[PDB]
Design an enzyme around this catalytic site. Structure first.
Site, mmCIF file in Angstrom:
data_model
loop_
_atom_site.group_PDB
_atom_site.id
_atom_site.type_symbol
_atom_site.label_atom_id
_atom_site.label_comp_id
_atom_site.label_asym_id
_atom_site.label_seq_id
_atom_site.Cartn_x
_atom_site.Cartn_y
_atom_site.Cartn_z
ATOM 1 N N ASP A 40 -12.474 -11.253 -4.509
ATOM 2 C CA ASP A 40 -12.675 -10.731 -5.884
ATOM 3 C C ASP A 40 -13.830 -9.725 -5.863
ATOM 4 O OD1 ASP A 40 -10.824 -12.754 -6.293
ATOM 5 O OD2 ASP A 40 -12.062 -13.907 -7.682
ATOM 6 N N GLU A 58 -5.261 -14.845 -14.924
ATOM 7 C CA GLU A 58 -6.581 -14.699 -14.276
ATOM 8 C C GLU A 58 -7.219 -13.369 -14.657
ATOM 9 O OE1 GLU A 58 -6.780 -15.910 -10.111
ATOM 10 O OE2 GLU A 58 -4.676 -16.538 -10.211
#
Length: 417
Positions: free
Chosen positions: A47, A288
């Site tokens: 991420d 998400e």
């Protein structure tokens, strides 16, 4: 009184999801090459969170581009990762990254070819050993940053920690990230708690200033409140399904939503939970990394989802999904009719994840798994090629592939302290 339509969650329905096309060249990520370069021989990254101001502008500081990454050590000599023949199995090490996740920063004057900066927070500052994703917000010309992130285990709490960026002509340092502040966790009436579901999501804070009201809000991933297995796929969650597609199966176990909170102040200190913007009961368990692009006076709401977390009787690719509204609080409609914006190619279905659509249309993602033969594949833990998309009304279009981890700035901020 001018009567306004009341605020209500937009439903991403099973009928919407039945429109998902995994074979649309306008909504497919370009194929990642098996010969991709790797950013570090010391750590995995995944991420990636570019430094930005509260209005969403990707920011350099004194000409230095800065990214924050979820980061995990590579452990090539760990006995636990030696196979039958005494050889390192990278897949086991890679799969264990989440349990040992820490925030690092990287910098570059070109927006690529990142130089590793190391840990943002000294070991022991974080109240949880796991630091999961969020947003680094550059506050002012003194280089002060609020790092909004997810403190994970025990529980999952949206937190922030104030520090500052210091630059020289040789590089960038992150200093003074010392005091983590609790903002909020799942409440159990709007957002599902660990008590209601051991697999609950509550993560990925995305703070922003609303361009219309100027008020501070924050998106996050959640699940719809209620005991796991208690939800009902009713007519609204099913939507306008065609003949023979009426069976919801056990899709009431998939309860993803995009949450929103509002701030009582301009400093992002005191937050109040609001009901969700988008719910996906019966459709997908994982909405998400929710984030906005503001374009053409509209709200483009993106979320990252997975093939694996689709409702029974539905499927689609890993990648970017999204919705558009005239208004912050909806109603939203699915982009391209289905919601799919940027799916992984079905020949490399796990090539990338945790995409981030920036306001310039550039989409950054990390490389997960790239096939190299009939059974063989490579692990990434490194940046994927950036890809430009165009937002046009309720449509999106893939345009152009750029270099690995290309994240150019939209603004430069002059910093001294």
């Amino acid at each position: 009184i001018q009567p306004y339509k009341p605020t209500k969650a937009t439903i991403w329905s099973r009928a919407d999801a039945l429109k998902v096309n995994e074979y649309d060249p306008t909504t497919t990520q370009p194929l990642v090459s098996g010969d991709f370069p790797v950013m570090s021989d010391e750590v995995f990254i995944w991420d990636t969170m570019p430094l930005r101001d509260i209005d969403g502008n990707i920011a350099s500081v004194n000409g230095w581009s800065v990214i924050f990454t979820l980061t995990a050590d590579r452990n090539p000599t760990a006995p636990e990762y030696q196979d039958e023949q005494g050889n390192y199995d990278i897949t086991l090490d890679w799969n264990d990254r989440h349990g040992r996740a820490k925030m690092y920063f990287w910098y570059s004057r070109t927006g690529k070819d990142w130089i590793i900066g190391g840990r943002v927070m000294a070991e022991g500052v974080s109240p949880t050993a796991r630091e999961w994703a969020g947003t680094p917000v550059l506050l002012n010309e003194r280089g002060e940053i609020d790092l909004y992130y997810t403190a994970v285990t025990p529980g999952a709490t949206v937190v922030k920690v104030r520090g500052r960026v210091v630059t020289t002509e040789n590089g960038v340092e992150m200093v003074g990230f010392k005091k983590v502040k609790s903002l909020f966790e799942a409440d159990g009436k709007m957002y599902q708690t660990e008590s209601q579901n051991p697999y609950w999501a509550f993560r990925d804070p995305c703070p922003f200033r609303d361009p219309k009201s100027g008020k501070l809000y924050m998106l996050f991933e959640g699940n719809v409140a209620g005991e796991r297995g208690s939800h009902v796929v009713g007519p609204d969650e099913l939507g306008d399904v065609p003949p023979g597609y009426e069976d919801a199966g056990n899709s009431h176990f998939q309860t993803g939503c995009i949450g929103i909170a509002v701030c009582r102040d301009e400093d992002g200190d005191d937050w109040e939970l609001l009901p969700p913007l988008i719910t996906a009961v019966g459709v997908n368990d994982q909405t998400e990394r929710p984030h906005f692009v503001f374009q053409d006076g509209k709200y483009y709401l993106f979320t990252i989802s997975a093939k694996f977390t689709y409702g029974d009787g539905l499927t689609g690719p890993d990648g970017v999904y999204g919705f558009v509204s005239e208004n912050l609080f909806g109603p939203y409609v699915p982009l391209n009719g289905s919601g799919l914006v940027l799916g992984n190619p079905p020949s490399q279905p796990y090539q990338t994840y945790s995409h981030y659509v920036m306001p310039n249309g550039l989409v950054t993602s990390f490389i997960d798994s790239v096939p190299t033969g009939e059974d063989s594949y490579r692990i990434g833990g490194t940046e994927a090629p950036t890809v430009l998309i165009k937002l046009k009304g309720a449509q999106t279009f893939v345009l152009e592939e750029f270099d690995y981890g290309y994240i150019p700035p939209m603004i430069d901020v002059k910093v001294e302290h």
